[PDB]
Each structure stands twice: as structure tokens, then as C-alpha cells.
Symmetry: C3
Subunit: 96 residues, 3 copies
């Protein structure tokens, strides 16, 4: 099941069975999508900006402290977080 | 794994026994009890389950959450006015026998 | 077969379990569960507030992970989803806690949990 997490400091990018990889790290807190699909971004900023490509998809400040949600992402798509977050591929139907 | 998506225009109902059955634009019926994840995006108003409002949107926002749904339920995304990087979809996550 | 999951309520249902072999969760008490298995879990649910509640204690409904509040609900006028996706470890508990027991309608309130993955990375 394709997953990744970055990471809690001093953890960096970690990765679970990427074969073929669905995801590829870019810098810190940032990866790139290699494979179209429905993904679940999760993460935490406790006991901040989530970005898909150039614009913001979540802005944690606020009744819960969980980052992310479910999103269709496509090849070359980036996610950046501007304490961890990770991603899991749920499905790749037809059609995305 | 059973899922369906509507839009973005001019795409319609895209579908992947079925767990869901389209009704018309933006609207589907649930054919299977289960735990479902509804997702999507509204690029600028409300999500319904059997005529009751479950989310209301007012920037591009996220549609959905996780919902147990039963045979017969419908899911609709309604706009005040027509006047579209807008889509929504559903994936079936599980069907434990305790969802009925 | 699977995913491993559990649900509490709505009343009269208590803890119900599916795909418990081998178990990922242990019931601890009403509305409260223990994690048996490290994992990526998705927590979901419905809180139905008593919109006519008006006793002494202030209104608030909370989801906890151990001693940390992870979701707080103070609007008594609408039925609200609870949960999220979390990395969870053996001995973590998740509990859903009402400031007083008539702040919620328990015949329409529940929460459950599903195991999405164990990456062989968390802890």
C-alpha cells in the first residue's frame, strides 16, 4: 500500500511500498505525485498551510488538529506543508 | 474497489455488483450499506443526504467527509444558481455487517 | 474479510467489531477504545446534540486521543461528524466524552474506526 510520511523532526521522508512509486519527495515537507489517484493526506501540528501545487487546500489554526483530507491528485502534482503529515493512496480507478 | 465521480463538467457520472446508481446530474443513490468516503471540490453550495443538508459551502473548498450510508440513501450537491472546476465522488471503504 | 474496524452506538448498540482476527482494537468501556495494533486508522462518527439541553454544565463534546483533545464540539444546534485519520500505537486510547450525559442524544450518536494500513514504518 503506497504511503509516505515527513516525518517528525529529526525524521525526514519515509516511504512504504512504492513499487512502482506513487509519490516522490521534492524537498522537506514537500513531495510530488507520480501516479494519478484518490489519496488521503493526514498529519498533525500538535499536542500552517497545506498546499496542492500553487494554492492552499487547508489552513490549520480551530476545533480539530488533523491535517489533510481526501483528494484526487494527478502526475506532477505537488503537496507542501508551509508535527508531521503523510499520504496514502486509497484507489486508482479508471478515470482520474 | 467501488467508487463513482461526477464532473467536472463536461464529464458526467464516471463509475468504477454496483454499490451506487446514478440518478441524474450531481445525484446518486446508494445500493449498498457501508462506510463511504465522499470527496470533491467546489471551485467558485450544499451537500445533501435524503433531503437533509450535511455540508454547506460558501475560494475552492472541499466537499464531504466519512459517512455510513444505507440502501436507498441519495447524495446530492446543490447550487443556488447555475451561474465549474467542481466535482464530487464517493468511494466505498468497507461493509462491516454492523452497518445496516 | 476486513478491514478491521469497530463502532460504538448508537444506543442500544454498544461496541460492535468487524474483522477482529487478529484484533486491532480492544473495548475498554462505553465510548472508549484501546488500540492493539500500530497503524494508520480513520476515525469517523456522528454526534447528535440535545438542542434542548439547558442544565448547569456548559455544553461541550470532545474526542480524545489519550489525554489529548483532538476534536471539540460546542454547537448544540446541529448533528456533526467526528474523527479524522490518525497514526495510532498500541495502548493509545480514543474516547468520546460529553460534559454531562444529556448534552447528546445517544440514540443518534456514534463513532467508529477503521484500520487503513500498518506501515511497517510507525512508530
Amino acid at each position: 500500500p503506497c504511503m509516505a510520511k515527513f516525518g517528525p523532526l529529526p525524521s525526514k521522508w519515509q516511504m512504504a511500498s512504492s513499487e512502482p512509486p506513487c509519490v516522490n519527495k521534492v524537498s522537506d515537507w514537500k513531495l510530488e505525485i507520480l501516479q494519478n489517484g484518490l489519496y488521503l493526506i493526514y498529519g498533525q501540528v500538535a499536542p500552517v498551510r497545506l498546499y496542492k501545487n500553487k494554492d492552499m487546500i487547508q489552513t490549520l489554526t480551530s476545533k480539530i488538529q488533523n491535517v489533510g483530507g481526501t483528494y484526487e491528485l494527478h502526475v506532477g502534482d505537488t503537496i507542501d506543508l508551509i508535527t508531521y503529515w503523510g499520504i496514502i493512496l486509497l484507489a486508482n480507478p479508471q478515470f482520474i
